[PDB]
Every structure is written in structure tokens, then in C-alpha cells.
Amino acid sequence: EQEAHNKALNQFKRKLLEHRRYDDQLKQRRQNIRDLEKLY
Amino acid sequence: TQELQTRAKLLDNEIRIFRSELQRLSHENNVMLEKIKDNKEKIKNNRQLPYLVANVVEVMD
Structure with a gap:
């Protein structure tokens, strides 16, 4: 509440939720390049 | 607060x-x-029919 260090940590918890959203995409798109590279 | 500041940086x-x-x-x-x-x-162009038959007397492998 009073502290201005809680406003600093809220900006980086929106980037941390984006890092969880990005992990599901990156690991799924990387496994699709490994399957298609054995066919290739 | 030092541990949380180093996560943020x-x-x-x-x-x-x-x-x-x-x-x-x-x-x-x-x-x-x-x-x-x-x-x-x-x-698919090379797989075109028709095509000869054979059998394999040996795989050198």
C-alpha cells in the first residue's frame, strides 16, 4: 500500500505472467521443428 | 527487499x-x-504407375 517498492514489483509480475504464457508456446513450437526435421 | 530487487533487475x-x-x-x-x-x-511424379516387380536376393547391409 504505502510503499513505492510494491509498485515496482507489480510491473515485473506482469512480465512474469507473460513468461508463463510464452513458455507454453515456445516449447510447443520447438517440438514441431524437431518432428519435421527428421522427415525433412 | 534485496532478494526481490534482484529478481526485478x-x-x-x-x-x-x-x-x-x-x-x-x-x-x-x-x-x-x-x-x-x-x-x-x-x-509423387516419380511414384507414377506402372512399375516393374522384383524381390531382394540379398541386403548387403
Whole structure:
């Protein structure tokens, strides 16, 4: 509440939720390049 | 507060690696789907019927 260090940590918890959203995409798109590279 | 400040200083650089790496994989994964359609048009031309029969007397292996 009073502290201005809680406003600093809220900006980086929106980037941390984006890092969880990005992990599901990156690991799924990387496994699709490994399957298609054995066919290739 | 020192432990939480060091988590915050690291994520200023980190969101740049994730953005640059999702763009690399999505353009590479568009090129892998086009490779397997292009080579398959040339396999299907050679697979054309008719074609002789044989058997394999030996695999040298």
C-alpha cells in the first residue's frame, strides 16, 4: 500500500505472467521443428 | 527487499530474449511445412504407375 517498492514489483509480475504464457508456446513450437526435421 | 530487487533487475533483460525467440520459431515452423509439400510433389511424379516387380536376393547391409 504505502510503499513505492510494491509498485515496482507489480510491473515485473506482469512480465512474469507473460513468461508463463510464452513458455507454453515456445516449447510447443520447438517440438514441431524437431518432428519435421527428421522427415525433412 | 534485496532478494526481490534482484529478481526485478533480471527480468528487464529477460523479456527481450523471449520475444526474439518466439519470432524465430514461428517463421522457422512456417518454412518446415513448405519444405515437405514441395519435395512431395517431386516424389509423387516419380511414384507414377506402372512399375516393374522384383524381390531382394540379398541386403548387403
